[PDB]
């Protein structure tokens, strides 16, 4: 299967605080594996997977030193953004960054990413070519001009095509068991009477989170008049979802629920069972 690595960084300033708080989180195959937070006493990158604790002491110090550098980089960026957008002091502001590597089932790079957001909105992003920048906002043109003239791009391209890839290979070998294993969805239908009956199709114990539930009546997926919930974590590393339809009591068993998930050998089909 295909693999990924990302680093989500945030700096937040608030109308009380003097200095922004900076937080960085790493993920491998969409699972958190490292975290740093400037609000902790002795701020440090610390592991979040049993398979990462295996890494040595000098690995941990190196990372921490990077985080400290990032913190300053974000602090100065936040101050400049207030000017770029003519924001008077005494509000809350946020600056976010996503960066990382995507790899195919062959372990070769598919794509690098590098994107920034201000106030939760796109500010500037490195395009897929890893050479040019997209920036929509008028204010963001200031940044795009600086970076165009500086080989910011070549810096990030070297990281995304190099270190990001090599370390992801390292990490993948080490924590091979947690990450490769998918959990197929276990599904069932529950019954809830009404004026009319409510069929609720459940999917439980699945990983990763992407899943699709449909309801069918004589071969037609029922678009409107189907309720559902957003996919949600059980808290044990699996996820849940359900989809309900309202059908006449006695027209039960003419309805079939379908669950599509990457862990299944094929889609599951289910009906109401007494």
């Amino acid at each position: 299967g295909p693999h990924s690595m990302r680093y989500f960084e945030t700096a937040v300033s608030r109308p009380g605080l003097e200095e922004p708080r900076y937080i960085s989180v790493g993920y491998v195959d969409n699972k958190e594996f490292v975290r740093f937070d400037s609000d902790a006493e002795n701020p440090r990158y610390e592991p979040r997977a049993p398979w990462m604790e295996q890494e040595g002491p000098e690995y941990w110090e190196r990372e921490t030193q990077k985080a400290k550098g990032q913190e300053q980089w974000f602090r100065v960026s936040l101050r400049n953004l207030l000017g770029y957008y003519n924001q008077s002091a005494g509000g809350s502001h946020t600056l976010q960054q996503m960066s990382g590597c995507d790899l195919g089932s062959d372990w070769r790079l598919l794509r690098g990413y590098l994107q920034f957001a201000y106030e939760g909105r796109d500010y500037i992003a490195l395009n897929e070519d890893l050479k040019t920048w997209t920036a929509a906002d008028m204010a963001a043109q200031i940044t795009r001009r600086k970076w165009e003239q500086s080989g910011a791009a070549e810096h990030y391209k070297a990281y995304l095509e190099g270190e990001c890839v090599e370390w992801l290979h390292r990490y993948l070998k080490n924590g091979n068991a947690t990450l490769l294993r998918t959990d197929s969805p276990k599904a069932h239908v529950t019954h809830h009477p009404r004026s009319e009956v409510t069929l609720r199709c459940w999917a439980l114990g699945f990983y990763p989170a992407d899943i699709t539930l449909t309801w069918q009546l004589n071969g037609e997926e029922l678009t409107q008049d189907m309720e559902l919930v957003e996919t949600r974590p059980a808290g044990d590393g699996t996820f849940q979802k359900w989809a309900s339809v309202v059908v006449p009591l006695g027209k039960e068993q003419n309805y079939t629920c379908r669950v599509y998930h990457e862990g299944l050998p094929e889609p599951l089909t289910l009906r109401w069972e007494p």
């Binding site: 680093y7 790493g26 490292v34 990077k66 550098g69 990032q70 980089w73 910011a152």
Partner: peptide
């Protein structure tokens, strides 16, 4: 392995 932003 975290990134370090371009100064």
């Amino acid at each position: 392995f975290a990134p370090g932003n371009y100064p």
